[PDB]
Amino acid sequence: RTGKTNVIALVLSVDEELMGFTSQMVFGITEVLATTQYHLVVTPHTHAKDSMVPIRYILETGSADGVIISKIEPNDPRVRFMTERKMPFVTHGRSDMGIEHAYHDFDNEAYAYEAVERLAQCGRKRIAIIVPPSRFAFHDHARKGFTRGIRDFGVSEFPLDAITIETPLDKIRDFGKRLMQSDDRPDGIVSISGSSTIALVAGFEAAGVRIGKDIDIVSKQSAEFLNWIQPQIHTVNEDIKLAGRELAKALLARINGAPPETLQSVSRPVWSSMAPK
Amino acid sequence: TGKTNVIALVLSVDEELMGFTSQMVFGITEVLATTQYHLVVTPHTHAKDSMVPIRYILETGSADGVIISKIEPNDPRVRFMTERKMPFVTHGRSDMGIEHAYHDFDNEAYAYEAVERLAQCGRKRIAIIVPPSRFAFHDHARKGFTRGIRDFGVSEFPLDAITIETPLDKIRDFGKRLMQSDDRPDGIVSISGSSTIALVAGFEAAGVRIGKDIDIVSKQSAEFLNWIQPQIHTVNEDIKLAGRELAKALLARINGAPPETLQSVSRPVWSSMAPK
């Protein structure tokens, strides 16, 4: 098929986090598409090994006019493939491979940097971070921002490797409890996932630790939920709704031939108003 | 007409915070993955444009089958699509003499078993937070709760000020003022994981300790409530399974299977993270 399909393909890994609020992203897209003739098709894949499968399928069948992808690697084969094959696309996240494409992303570097600052201002001295799998680009951003922050704000890092934000929550909780039972424990935590934080706090409290007294937490969240039962968590909002709208706008313009360099945006960390000041 | 190989999932943008909607979506697509059908997600904003996507799909013939939710007992969409011979499945159940494919959660049994659990906890004055009265699962929950109050020898603490669709900040505000009264319930049945979160916030802001001064039973569409609040009595509604069942039924319906054979109701299961 080669004709105008009026289809936007949203490609999503089924492997998502608990508190991803994915549908808010979806509705951001469709809200924008509603003033157009485009339909949103949701196209899943299960894991890393079949990441390229839906991309190849879309281009083999020509079933979409544009593609939305996420979980971007710095050298992402999907970006490369769709660029070569002239398929309009937008990424939720950013690549680093010499390819100018439409994108929208959250500034995880600035978040991690400002997270350390916030913890330092709380008087905390030994800071740990829970990062994504190292293969995704926003791991590096977070890691980069965190590392700068440790140095710029005169504190030290409490080393941590046992878990990532994709570690199952039950095992995150188990880890968080054992951590606070040790004599060598951090007094500050930076989390790159609202889901992981939930599990961590659970493990912490199970160890007797009081959030905001014995340890402080800074966490991202893709919707406002962390402060309801845990008001002492320092929360940063990532606007997943806005992301969806921006992804749709950029892709529509790209389909209509706008230059990729003009279709790029990065949203900054904002402290949740329910977060302690 | 023609075969579109499209399934249209029609969703109200107006969803709850902890709906975990995408888990439902992935349930659908997991089933469709062994078929040639594509899933189109078709939103509408509110009640006033509920029929809009339904009419548009049938006007354009843009789908082979439709999935809808937020079912009323006398639902105009079910009526419309039945007459117009559009294959469809509901997430929820109608009550208008129309046999159609459906999958639903047994909200009546949940509310009933919720009251029982609270009574066994020694609680004597029980309040419930229900959805807007226009949706069918309101009536189910209301029915189960009412039977439960009578069968398990307790009384209802009246509540009308809020629903599960009331904004969370105002639920919190309400929950705080409630536990600050002198007339307060000692048990709560919630039909929404989202509302529970807000409620507990308001309760704790009033000094009340969950599990001592009051017990809560809540639905949740994913396992999340017990992580920071282990004392909430939690019932899992499997939204993932729901998605799979909706897709299976619709595929069979499209291929001409009788509606009466394409109906299922999932029962309440107590979350294993819930207190025993």
Coordinates of C-alpha atoms in Angstrom, one line a residue:
Chain A
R1 CA 0.0 0.0 0.0
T2 CA 1.2 3.5 -0.9
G3 CA -1.8 5.8 -0.6
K4 CA -2.5 8.4 2.1
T5 CA -3.7 6.2 5.0
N6 CA -4.8 8.9 7.5
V7 CA -3.3 6.6 10.1
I8 CA -0.8 7.5 12.8
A9 CA 0.9 4.4 14.3
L10 CA 1.7 4.6 18.0
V11 CA 4.3 2.0 18.8
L12 CA 4.5 1.0 22.4
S13 CA 6.4 -1.6 24.4
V14 CA 3.9 -3.7 26.5
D15 CA 6.7 -3.6 29.1
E16 CA 5.7 -0.4 30.8
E17 CA 5.9 0.8 34.4
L18 CA 2.9 0.6 36.8
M19 CA 2.5 4.3 37.2
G20 CA 3.2 5.2 33.6
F21 CA -0.3 6.7 33.0
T22 CA 0.2 5.8 29.4
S23 CA -3.4 6.6 28.3
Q24 CA -2.9 10.3 29.3
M25 CA -0.1 10.3 26.7
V26 CA -2.5 8.6 24.2
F27 CA -5.2 11.2 24.8
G28 CA -2.7 13.9 24.3
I29 CA -2.1 12.6 20.9
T30 CA -5.8 12.1 20.0
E31 CA -6.8 15.5 21.3
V32 CA -4.5 17.0 18.6
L33 CA -5.5 14.5 15.9
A34 CA -9.2 15.2 16.5
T35 CA -9.0 18.4 14.4
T36 CA -7.6 16.3 11.6
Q37 CA -8.7 13.2 9.6
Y38 CA -6.0 11.0 11.2
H39 CA -6.8 7.9 13.1
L40 CA -4.5 6.6 15.9
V41 CA -3.6 3.0 15.6
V42 CA -1.9 1.5 18.7
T43 CA 0.8 -1.1 17.8
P44 CA 2.4 -3.1 20.6
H45 CA 5.5 -5.1 20.8
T46 CA 6.4 -7.3 23.8
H47 CA 10.1 -6.7 24.5
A48 CA 13.6 -5.7 23.3
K49 CA 14.0 -8.6 20.9
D50 CA 10.9 -7.6 18.8
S51 CA 11.4 -3.8 19.0
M52 CA 12.1 -3.6 15.3
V53 CA 9.2 -5.9 14.3
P54 CA 6.4 -3.4 14.3
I55 CA 8.6 -0.8 12.6
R56 CA 9.4 -3.2 9.8
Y57 CA 5.8 -4.3 9.6
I58 CA 4.5 -0.7 9.2
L59 CA 7.0 0.0 6.3
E60 CA 6.5 -3.4 4.7
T61 CA 2.7 -2.9 4.5
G62 CA 2.7 0.9 4.3
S63 CA -0.1 1.0 6.9
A64 CA 0.7 4.4 8.4
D65 CA 1.6 8.0 7.3
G66 CA 3.7 8.5 10.4
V67 CA 5.1 6.7 13.5
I68 CA 5.5 7.6 17.1
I69 CA 8.1 5.6 19.1
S70 CA 9.6 5.8 22.6
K71 CA 12.3 4.2 24.8
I72 CA 14.9 5.8 22.6
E73 CA 18.5 4.5 22.5
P74 CA 21.3 6.9 21.6
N75 CA 22.0 4.8 18.5
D76 CA 18.5 3.7 17.9
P77 CA 18.0 1.3 14.9
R78 CA 14.4 2.4 14.4
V79 CA 15.3 6.0 14.0
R80 CA 18.0 4.9 11.5
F81 CA 15.7 2.6 9.6
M82 CA 12.7 5.0 9.3
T83 CA 15.1 7.8 8.3
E84 CA 16.5 5.8 5.5
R85 CA 13.1 4.6 4.4
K86 CA 11.6 8.1 4.4
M87 CA 8.9 7.3 7.0
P88 CA 7.8 10.4 8.9
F89 CA 8.3 9.9 12.7
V90 CA 8.7 11.5 16.0
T91 CA 10.4 10.2 19.1
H92 CA 9.4 10.5 22.7
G93 CA 13.0 10.9 23.9
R94 CA 16.1 11.9 22.0
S95 CA 18.7 10.1 19.9
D96 CA 22.4 11.0 19.6
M97 CA 23.5 9.6 16.2
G98 CA 23.8 12.6 13.9
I99 CA 20.2 12.3 12.8
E100 CA 18.0 15.4 13.0
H101 CA 14.4 14.2 13.6
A102 CA 11.2 15.5 15.3
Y103 CA 11.2 14.8 19.0
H104 CA 9.8 15.7 22.4
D105 CA 11.5 14.7 25.6
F106 CA 11.6 15.4 29.3
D107 CA 14.8 17.0 30.6
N108 CA 16.0 14.1 32.8
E109 CA 19.5 15.6 33.2
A110 CA 18.1 18.8 34.6
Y111 CA 15.8 16.8 36.9
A112 CA 18.6 14.6 38.3
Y113 CA 20.8 17.7 38.8
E114 CA 18.1 19.7 40.6
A115 CA 17.2 16.6 42.5
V116 CA 20.6 16.4 44.1
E117 CA 20.5 20.2 44.8
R118 CA 17.1 19.8 46.6
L119 CA 18.5 16.9 48.7
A120 CA 21.6 18.9 49.5
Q121 CA 19.4 21.8 50.6
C122 CA 17.7 19.4 52.9
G123 CA 21.0 18.7 54.6
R124 CA 21.5 15.2 53.1
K125 CA 25.1 14.1 52.5
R126 CA 25.0 10.7 51.0
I127 CA 22.9 10.4 47.9
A128 CA 21.9 7.3 45.8
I129 CA 20.1 7.2 42.5
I130 CA 17.9 4.6 40.8
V131 CA 18.5 4.8 37.0
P132 CA 16.9 3.1 34.0
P133 CA 18.6 0.3 32.0
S134 CA 21.8 1.9 30.7
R135 CA 20.9 1.3 27.0
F136 CA 18.2 3.9 26.9
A137 CA 19.3 7.5 26.3
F138 CA 17.5 9.0 29.3
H139 CA 19.6 6.8 31.6
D140 CA 22.7 8.8 30.4
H141 CA 20.9 12.1 30.9
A142 CA 19.9 11.2 34.4
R143 CA 23.3 9.8 35.2
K144 CA 25.0 12.8 33.7
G145 CA 22.9 15.3 35.7
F146 CA 23.2 13.3 38.9
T147 CA 27.0 13.1 38.6
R148 CA 27.3 16.8 38.0
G149 CA 25.0 17.5 40.9
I150 CA 27.1 15.4 43.4
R151 CA 30.2 17.5 42.4
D152 CA 28.5 21.0 42.2
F153 CA 26.6 20.8 45.4
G154 CA 29.3 19.4 47.7
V155 CA 27.9 16.0 48.6
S156 CA 28.9 12.4 47.9
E157 CA 27.2 9.5 46.1
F158 CA 26.1 6.4 47.9
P159 CA 26.8 3.6 45.3
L160 CA 23.9 1.5 44.1
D161 CA 23.8 -1.1 41.3
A162 CA 21.4 -3.8 42.5
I163 CA 18.3 -2.3 41.0
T164 CA 17.0 -0.2 38.2
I165 CA 13.7 1.5 37.5
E166 CA 12.7 -1.6 35.6
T167 CA 13.4 -4.0 38.5
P168 CA 10.1 -5.7 39.6
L169 CA 8.5 -3.7 42.4
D170 CA 8.4 -6.5 44.9
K171 CA 12.2 -6.8 44.6
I172 CA 12.6 -3.0 44.8
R173 CA 10.7 -3.1 48.1
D174 CA 12.8 -5.9 49.4
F175 CA 16.0 -4.0 48.4
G176 CA 14.8 -0.8 50.0
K177 CA 14.2 -2.5 53.4
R178 CA 17.5 -4.3 53.6
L179 CA 19.2 -1.0 52.6
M180 CA 17.9 0.9 55.6
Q181 CA 18.7 -2.1 57.9
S182 CA 22.4 -1.7 57.1
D183 CA 24.7 0.7 59.0
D184 CA 25.9 2.0 55.7
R185 CA 22.8 3.7 54.3
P186 CA 22.1 6.8 52.3
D187 CA 20.2 9.8 53.6
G188 CA 18.9 10.8 50.2
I189 CA 17.4 9.2 47.2
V190 CA 16.9 10.3 43.6
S191 CA 14.3 8.2 41.7
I192 CA 13.8 8.3 37.9
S193 CA 10.5 6.4 38.3
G194 CA 7.3 7.1 40.3
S195 CA 6.7 3.4 40.3
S196 CA 10.1 2.5 41.8
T197 CA 9.6 5.2 44.5
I198 CA 6.3 3.7 45.6
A199 CA 8.1 0.3 46.1
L200 CA 11.1 2.0 47.7
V201 CA 9.1 3.9 50.3
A202 CA 7.2 0.7 51.1
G203 CA 10.5 -1.1 51.9
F204 CA 11.8 2.0 53.8
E205 CA 8.8 2.2 56.1
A206 CA 8.9 -1.6 56.6
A207 CA 12.4 -0.9 58.0
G208 CA 11.2 1.7 60.5
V209 CA 12.5 4.7 58.4
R210 CA 10.4 7.9 58.4
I211 CA 10.3 9.7 55.0
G212 CA 11.5 13.3 55.4
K213 CA 13.1 12.7 58.8
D214 CA 15.6 9.8 58.4
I215 CA 15.9 10.1 54.6
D216 CA 14.6 12.4 51.9
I217 CA 13.3 11.3 48.4
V218 CA 13.1 13.2 45.2
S219 CA 11.0 11.5 42.5
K220 CA 9.6 12.0 39.0
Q221 CA 6.0 11.2 38.4
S222 CA 4.0 11.1 35.1
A223 CA 0.9 12.2 37.0
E224 CA 0.2 13.8 40.4
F225 CA -0.2 10.9 42.8
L226 CA 2.9 10.5 45.1
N227 CA 2.0 13.2 47.6
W228 CA -1.5 12.0 48.4
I229 CA -0.4 9.4 51.0
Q230 CA 3.3 10.4 51.0
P231 CA 3.3 14.3 51.2
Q232 CA 7.0 14.3 52.3
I233 CA 8.3 13.1 48.9
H234 CA 9.8 15.9 46.8
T235 CA 7.9 15.5 43.6
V236 CA 8.7 16.6 40.0
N237 CA 5.9 16.5 37.4
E238 CA 6.6 15.1 34.0
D239 CA 3.7 16.2 31.8
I240 CA 2.9 13.1 29.9
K241 CA -0.3 14.7 28.6
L242 CA 1.6 17.6 27.1
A243 CA 4.1 15.1 25.7
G244 CA 1.4 13.4 23.7
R245 CA 0.1 16.7 22.3
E246 CA 3.7 17.7 21.3
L247 CA 4.4 14.4 19.7
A248 CA 1.3 14.7 17.6
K249 CA 1.9 18.3 16.6
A250 CA 5.5 17.6 15.5
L251 CA 4.6 14.5 13.5
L252 CA 1.7 16.2 11.7
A253 CA 4.1 19.0 10.7
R254 CA 6.8 16.4 9.7
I255 CA 4.2 14.6 7.5
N256 CA 3.4 18.0 5.9
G257 CA 7.1 18.5 5.2
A258 CA 8.4 20.9 8.0
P259 CA 12.1 20.6 8.7
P260 CA 13.0 18.3 11.6
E261 CA 15.1 20.9 13.4
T262 CA 12.0 23.0 14.0
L263 CA 10.0 20.2 15.5
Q264 CA 12.0 19.6 18.6
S265 CA 11.2 20.4 22.3
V266 CA 12.3 19.6 25.8
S267 CA 10.0 20.1 28.8
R268 CA 11.8 21.1 32.0
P269 CA 11.3 19.7 35.5
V270 CA 8.6 21.5 37.5
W271 CA 8.2 20.9 41.3
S272 CA 4.8 19.6 42.1
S273 CA 2.8 22.1 44.0
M274 CA 1.8 19.3 46.5
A275 CA 5.6 18.9 47.1
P276 CA 7.1 20.3 50.3
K277 CA 8.8 23.7 49.8
Chain B
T1 CA -19.2 -1.9 2.9
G2 CA -15.9 -3.7 3.1
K3 CA -13.6 -5.5 5.6
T4 CA -11.6 -2.8 7.3
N5 CA -9.6 -5.1 9.6
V6 CA -10.1 -2.4 12.2
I7 CA -11.3 -2.7 15.8
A8 CA -12.4 0.6 17.2
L9 CA -11.8 1.1 20.9
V10 CA -14.1 4.0 22.0
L11 CA -13.0 5.6 25.2
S12 CA -14.1 8.6 27.3
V13 CA -11.1 10.9 27.9
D14 CA -12.7 11.4 31.3
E15 CA -11.0 8.5 33.1
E16 CA -9.9 8.0 36.7
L17 CA -6.2 8.6 37.7
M18 CA -5.6 5.0 38.6
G19 CA -7.5 3.5 35.7
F20 CA -4.4 1.8 34.2
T21 CA -6.3 2.0 30.9
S22 CA -3.3 0.9 28.8
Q23 CA -3.2 -2.5 30.5
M24 CA -6.8 -2.9 29.2
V25 CA -5.6 -1.8 25.8
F26 CA -2.7 -4.3 25.8
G27 CA -5.1 -7.1 26.7
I28 CA -7.0 -6.3 23.5
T29 CA -3.9 -6.1 21.3
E30 CA -2.4 -9.2 22.7
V31 CA -5.4 -11.1 21.4
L32 CA -5.5 -9.3 18.1
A33 CA -1.8 -10.0 17.5
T34 CA -2.8 -13.5 16.2
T35 CA -5.2 -11.9 13.8
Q36 CA -5.1 -9.3 11.0
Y37 CA -7.1 -6.7 13.0
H38 CA -5.6 -3.3 13.9
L39 CA -6.7 -1.4 17.0
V40 CA -7.8 2.2 16.5
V41 CA -8.3 4.2 19.7
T42 CA -11.2 6.6 19.3
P43 CA -11.8 9.2 22.0
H44 CA -14.7 11.4 23.0
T45 CA -14.5 14.1 25.7
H46 CA -17.7 13.8 27.7
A47 CA -21.3 12.6 28.1
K48 CA -22.7 15.1 25.5
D49 CA -20.6 13.6 22.7
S50 CA -20.8 10.0 23.7
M51 CA -22.8 9.0 20.6
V52 CA -20.6 11.0 18.3
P53 CA -17.8 8.4 17.7
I54 CA -20.4 5.7 17.4
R55 CA -22.4 7.5 14.7
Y56 CA -19.2 8.5 12.9
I57 CA -17.9 4.9 12.8
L58 CA -21.2 3.6 11.3
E59 CA -21.5 6.6 9.0
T60 CA -18.0 6.0 7.6
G61 CA -17.9 2.2 8.1
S62 CA -14.4 2.7 9.5
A63 CA -14.4 -0.4 11.7
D64 CA -15.5 -4.1 11.7
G65 CA -16.3 -4.0 15.4
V66 CA -16.5 -1.6 18.3
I67 CA -15.6 -1.8 22.0
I68 CA -17.4 0.5 24.4
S69 CA -17.5 1.1 28.2
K70 CA -19.2 3.2 30.8
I71 CA -22.4 1.3 30.1
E72 CA -25.8 2.6 31.1
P73 CA -28.7 0.2 31.8
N74 CA -30.6 1.7 28.8
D75 CA -27.5 2.6 26.7
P76 CA -28.3 4.4 23.4
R77 CA -25.0 3.1 21.8
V78 CA -25.9 -0.5 22.4
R79 CA -29.3 0.1 21.0
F80 CA -27.9 2.0 18.0
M81 CA -25.2 -0.5 17.1
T82 CA -27.6 -3.5 17.5
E83 CA -30.1 -1.9 15.1
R84 CA -27.4 -1.0 12.6
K85 CA -25.9 -4.5 12.8
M86 CA -22.4 -3.3 13.9
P87 CA -20.6 -6.1 15.8
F88 CA -19.7 -4.8 19.3
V89 CA -18.8 -5.8 22.8
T90 CA -19.3 -3.8 26.0
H91 CA -17.0 -3.5 29.0
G92 CA -19.9 -3.6 31.5
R93 CA -23.5 -4.7 31.1
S94 CA -26.7 -3.3 29.8
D95 CA -30.2 -4.1 31.1
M96 CA -32.6 -3.4 28.2
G97 CA -33.6 -6.8 26.7
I98 CA -30.7 -6.8 24.3
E99 CA -28.4 -9.8 24.2
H100 CA -24.9 -8.7 23.3
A101 CA -21.3 -9.8 23.9
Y102 CA -19.9 -8.4 27.1
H103 CA -17.3 -8.7 29.9
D104 CA -17.8 -7.1 33.2
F105 CA -16.5 -7.1 36.8
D106 CA -18.9 -8.3 39.5
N107 CA -19.3 -5.0 41.3
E108 CA -22.4 -6.3 43.2
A109 CA -20.5 -9.2 44.7
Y110 CA -17.6 -6.9 45.5
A111 CA -19.7 -4.4 47.4
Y112 CA -21.4 -7.3 49.2
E113 CA -18.2 -9.0 50.1
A114 CA -16.7 -5.6 51.1
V115 CA -19.4 -5.0 53.7
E116 CA -18.9 -8.6 55.0
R117 CA -15.1 -7.9 55.4
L118 CA -15.7 -4.7 57.3
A119 CA -18.3 -6.4 59.6
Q120 CA -15.8 -9.1 60.3
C121 CA -13.4 -6.4 61.3
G122 CA -15.9 -5.3 63.9
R123 CA -17.0 -2.1 62.0
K124 CA -20.6 -1.1 62.6
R125 CA -21.3 2.0 60.6
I126 CA -20.4 1.7 56.9
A127 CA -20.3 4.3 54.1
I128 CA -19.9 3.7 50.4
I129 CA -18.6 5.9 47.5
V130 CA -20.4 5.0 44.3
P131 CA -20.1 6.2 40.7
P132 CA -22.7 8.6 39.1
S133 CA -26.1 6.9 39.3
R134 CA -26.5 6.8 35.5
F135 CA -24.0 4.0 34.9
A136 CA -25.1 0.4 35.4
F137 CA -22.2 -0.6 37.7
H138 CA -23.4 2.1 40.2
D139 CA -26.6 0.1 40.6
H140 CA -24.7 -3.2 41.0
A141 CA -22.4 -1.8 43.7
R142 CA -25.4 0.0 45.4
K143 CA -27.3 -3.3 45.3
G144 CA -24.5 -5.4 46.7
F145 CA -23.8 -2.9 49.4
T146 CA -27.5 -2.6 50.4
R147 CA -27.9 -6.4 50.7
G148 CA -24.6 -6.5 52.7
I149 CA -25.7 -4.0 55.2
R150 CA -28.8 -6.1 56.0
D151 CA -27.3 -9.6 55.8
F152 CA -24.3 -8.8 58.0
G153 CA -26.1 -6.8 60.7
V154 CA -24.6 -3.4 60.4
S155 CA -25.9 0.1 59.4
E156 CA -25.1 2.5 56.6
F157 CA -23.5 5.8 57.3
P158 CA -25.2 8.0 54.7
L159 CA -23.1 9.8 52.0
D160 CA -24.1 11.7 48.9
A161 CA -21.6 14.6 48.7
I162 CA -19.1 12.8 46.6
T163 CA -18.8 10.1 43.9
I164 CA -15.8 8.2 42.5
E165 CA -15.8 10.8 39.7
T166 CA -15.5 13.7 42.1
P167 CA -12.1 15.5 41.7
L168 CA -9.5 14.0 44.1
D169 CA -8.6 17.2 45.9
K170 CA -12.2 17.6 46.9
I171 CA -12.4 14.0 47.9
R172 CA -9.4 14.6 50.2
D173 CA -11.1 17.7 51.6
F174 CA -14.3 15.7 52.2
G175 CA -12.5 12.8 53.8
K176 CA -10.7 15.2 56.3
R177 CA -13.9 17.0 57.3
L178 CA -15.7 13.6 57.7
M179 CA -13.2 12.1 60.3
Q180 CA -13.3 15.5 62.2
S181 CA -17.0 15.2 62.8
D182 CA -18.3 13.6 65.8
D183 CA -20.6 11.5 63.7
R184 CA -18.3 9.4 61.7
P185 CA -18.4 6.0 59.9
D186 CA -15.9 3.3 61.0
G187 CA -15.9 1.6 57.6
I188 CA -15.6 2.7 54.0
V189 CA -16.4 0.8 50.8
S190 CA -14.8 2.4 47.7
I191 CA -15.6 1.7 44.1
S192 CA -12.5 3.4 42.9
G193 CA -8.8 3.0 43.7
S194 CA -8.4 6.7 42.7
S195 CA -11.0 7.9 45.2
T196 CA -9.4 5.7 48.0
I197 CA -6.1 7.4 47.6
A198 CA -7.6 10.8 48.0
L199 CA -9.8 9.6 50.9
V200 CA -6.9 8.1 52.9
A201 CA -5.0 11.4 52.4
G202 CA -7.9 13.3 53.9
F203 CA -8.4 10.7 56.7
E204 CA -4.7 10.8 57.7
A205 CA -4.7 14.6 57.6
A206 CA -7.4 14.3 60.3
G207 CA -5.3 12.1 62.6
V208 CA -7.2 9.0 61.8
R209 CA -5.1 5.8 61.5
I210 CA -6.1 3.4 58.8
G211 CA -6.9 0.0 60.2
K212 CA -7.4 1.1 63.8
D213 CA -9.9 3.9 63.8
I214 CA -11.5 2.9 60.5
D215 CA -11.1 0.2 57.9
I216 CA -11.2 0.6 54.1
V217 CA -12.1 -1.8 51.4
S218 CA -11.2 -0.8 47.8
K219 CA -11.2 -2.0 44.3
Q220 CA -8.1 -1.4 42.2
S221 CA -7.4 -2.0 38.5
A222 CA -3.8 -2.8 39.3
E223 CA -1.9 -3.9 42.4
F224 CA -0.8 -0.5 43.9
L225 CA -2.8 0.5 47.0
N226 CA -1.0 -1.7 49.6
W227 CA 2.5 -0.5 48.8
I228 CA 2.3 2.6 51.0
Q229 CA -1.0 1.7 52.6
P230 CA -0.8 -2.0 53.6
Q231 CA -3.8 -1.8 55.8
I232 CA -6.3 -1.1 53.0
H233 CA -8.4 -4.2 52.2
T234 CA -7.9 -4.5 48.5
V235 CA -9.8 -6.3 45.7
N236 CA -8.2 -6.7 42.3
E237 CA -10.2 -6.0 39.2
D238 CA -8.2 -7.6 36.4
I239 CA -8.3 -4.9 33.6
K240 CA -5.7 -6.9 31.6
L241 CA -7.9 -9.9 31.6
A242 CA -10.9 -7.6 30.7
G243 CA -9.1 -6.4 27.6
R244 CA -8.4 -10.0 26.5
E245 CA -12.0 -11.1 27.1
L246 CA -13.4 -8.1 25.2
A247 CA -11.2 -8.8 22.2
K248 CA -12.1 -12.6 22.2
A249 CA -15.8 -11.9 22.4
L250 CA -15.8 -9.3 19.6
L251 CA -13.7 -11.5 17.3
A252 CA -16.2 -14.3 17.7
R253 CA -19.1 -11.9 17.3
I254 CA -17.7 -10.5 14.1
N255 CA -17.5 -14.1 12.9
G256 CA -21.2 -14.6 13.7
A257 CA -21.2 -16.4 17.1
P258 CA -24.4 -15.9 19.2
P259 CA -24.1 -13.1 21.7
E260 CA -25.4 -15.2 24.6
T261 CA -22.3 -17.4 24.4
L262 CA -20.0 -14.3 24.5
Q263 CA -20.7 -13.1 28.0
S264 CA -18.5 -13.3 31.1
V265 CA -18.3 -11.7 34.6
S266 CA -15.1 -11.7 36.6
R267 CA -15.5 -12.1 40.3
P268 CA -13.8 -10.2 43.2
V269 CA -10.5 -11.6 44.4
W270 CA -8.8 -10.3 47.5
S271 CA -5.3 -9.0 46.7
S272 CA -2.6 -11.1 48.2
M273 CA -1.0 -7.9 49.6
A274 CA -4.3 -7.2 51.5
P275 CA -4.3 -8.0 55.2
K276 CA -5.6 -11.5 56.2

